[PDB]
Structure 1
Amino acid sequence: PPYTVVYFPVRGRCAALRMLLADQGQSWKEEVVTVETWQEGSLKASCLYGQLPKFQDGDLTLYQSNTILRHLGRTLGLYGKDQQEAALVDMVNDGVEDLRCKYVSLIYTNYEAGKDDYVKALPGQLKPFETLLSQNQGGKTFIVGDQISFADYNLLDLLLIHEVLAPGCLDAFPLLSAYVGRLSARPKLKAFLASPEYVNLPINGNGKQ
């Protein structure tokens, strides 16, 4: 594999980049890190910001999940057709990251106490993405332009973990609903999503979702 992913045995911040690699027909190696090996301290001290994931592309070593996504977007051509599209791809990815940050905070620090409020506020957080789709060819292709981008995989991951969190949360959004159906049916991605390496890994660290 020109690629190595180093991470804990969870989907978490590596699900989108794994979907991207599978859908793009790329091979990669998973190096898993147990809470025991990490807890020790050795690898953590060697990680730039003391966190995972860690990714290797040949001799290039990178940290930061959005950095890995952008790198694969640049090198495999999933970053829009021109600078204008590349800017909009970024804009969608940063909006996905902002919601992902709220989700992680719910999961890891206020699950049973914050859940109902999170779900109640959910439709307002997803509307921007339905609006974006509505402005790009009636929401019949991808989030930006008419070719898939790295932001499509991150957005897809985000919508799917939110349907696990609040079943039917996309029922009120036709374009977002259809987009998930369509992307999930791309041949290589459909196979990946149905596979044990994806299905049998917990979404998060602590058993909550």
Structure 2
Amino acid sequence: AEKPKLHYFNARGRMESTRWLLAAAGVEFEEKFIKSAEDLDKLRNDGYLMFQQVPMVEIDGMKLVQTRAILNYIASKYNLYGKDIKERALIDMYIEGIADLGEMILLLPVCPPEEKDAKLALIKEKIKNRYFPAFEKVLKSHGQDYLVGNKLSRADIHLVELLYYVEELDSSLISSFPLLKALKTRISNLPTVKKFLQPGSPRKPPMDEKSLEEARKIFRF
């Protein structure tokens, strides 16, 4: 009997794209925050984590690990995964490009300090020259307010989340991509997303060094 229950630490990390997708879908959720290695070990010892890792989400009577398993379930359940197999292929292709870029941004702070400047420069180059051109071209191709099927899907949600992180890195990177700018505004004004973006929501801030320190202690790295 439950709202979905999100098991993670109090940070974006690997859970934030799930927070975004549930919120976009209008689904209220609860979070159980891991604060210590001891908390993680309890989840493990109680049999809740198939591969001894989080994210884990309790939803519809079961316990799901692996970010993509969680996301795929939520997207299908709430009709955000397209209408057929071909639309799912477009969605998947798009969101896996988003994932590749998002992964780079997620792990930047765990890069060795002597590698960070080059890694950041590489991310900016890929945004400007690979990823933003590819999504701009999709929107330019059909002229529709959404990426796939002329209707909101998880692709729109995952992309606009990523546009917010790119803005935190360098607000100028989107400047030559007017359709991406317009998508960002449109998605951000949908009632459910607007509510998620407002202060006090479950949306999480950029990870600071204190949070990274907590991650290292919880996940033992």
Q: Same fold (TM over 0.5)?
A: yes
**Alpha-carbon deviation of 1:155?**
1.4
Corresponding residue for 1:120?
125
Corresponding residue for 1:111?
116
Corresponding residue for 2:205?
202
Quick one: which amino acid aligns to residue 203 of structure 1? Answer: P
**Alpha-carbon deviation of 1:207?**
5.9
Structure 1 portions without partners, runs of 5+: none
Please tell me whether residue 153 in structure 1 is matched to residue 154 in structure 2: no
Please tell me whether residue 56 in structure 1 is matched to residue 58 in structure 2: yes
CA separation of 1:9 and 1:78: change in aligned 2, threshold 3 A? same
**Alpha-carbon deviation of 1:176?**
0.8
Q: State how far apart, in whole Å, the 2-side matches of 1:185 and 1:93 are.
A: 21
Report the secondary structure of 1:196's partner residue.
coil
Q: CA RMSD in A?
A: 2.3
Answer yes or no: is the 8 Å Cα contact 1:163–1:169 preserved in 2. Answer: yes
Answer yes or no: is the 8 Å Cα contact 2:55–2:66 preserved in 1. Answer: yes
1:30-45, aligned counterparts within 5 Å? Answer: 30-38=31-39, 41-44=41-44
TM-score normalised to structure 1 length = 0.87
Quick one: which amino acid aligns to residue 180 of structure 2? Answer: L
1:159-198, aligned counterparts within 5 Å? Answer: 159-198=163-202
Instruction: Give the number of aligned pairs.
Output: 205
Answer yes or no: is the 8 Å Cα contact 1:3–1:58 preserved in 2. Answer: yes
Please tell me whether residue 132 in structure 1 is matched to residue 132 in structure 2: no
Corresponding residue for 2:101?
99
Q: State how far apart, in whole Å, the 2-side matches of 1:49 and 1:205 are.
A: 27
TM-score normalised to structure 2 length = 0.82
Corresponding residue for 2:147?
143
Moved more, 122-131 or 43-52: 43-52
**Alpha-carbon deviation of 1:174?**
0.8
Q: State how far apart, in whole Å, the 2-side matches of 1:37 and 1:171 are.
A: 45
Q: State how far apart, in whole Å, the 1-side matches of 2:208 and 2:57 are.
A: 19
**Alpha-carbon deviation of 1:111?**
3.3
Quick one: which amino acid aligns to residue 195 of structure 2? Answer: A
Aligned sequence identity (%): 29
**Alpha-carbon deviation of 1:12?**
2.5
